[PDB]
Ligand binder design. Structure first.
Ligand SMILES: *[C@@H]1O[C@H](CO)[C@@H](O)[C@H](O)[C@H]1NC(C)=O
Lengths: 49, 52
């Protein structure tokens, strides 16, 4: 006449803070580059474009 | 629930079950221990060796 009620559930492990995978949806974005330019007697200059 | 020595009617130990209630210290809610009655949650214990 005795009864044992068993319970169990899933939760994130401790490693999940450091060892996890990020699922991203990717859409067409932007394109950037760093260009190095020199002309005449002007020394090399660069900037993000 | 008796707080002092009690003499029961029964004559044979096998006829009775005695459960010790001593809550001075708490225990981890291990899946290998029978749960107590009511809100048995008493506190939190930090995990010492966390992943880093
Ligand atoms: C641009 O070119 C010159 C070539 O001597 C170099 O010294 C300079 O570091 C370059 N710029 C960058 C951002 O690397």
């Amino acid at each position: 006449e005795n009864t044992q009620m068993s319970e169990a559930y899933v939760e994130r492990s401790e490693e999940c803070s450091i060892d996890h995978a990020k699922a991203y949806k990717v859409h067409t974005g932007t394109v950037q580059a760093m260009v190095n330019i020199t002309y005449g007697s002007v020394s090399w200059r660069s900037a993000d474009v | 629930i008796t707080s002092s020595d009690h003499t029961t009617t029964c004559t044979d130990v096998k006829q009775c079950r005695a459960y010790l209630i001593d809550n001075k210290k708490w225990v981890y809610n291990s899946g290998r221990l029978p749960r107590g009655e009511g809100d048995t949650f008493k506190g939190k214990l930090h995990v010492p060796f966390v992943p880093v």
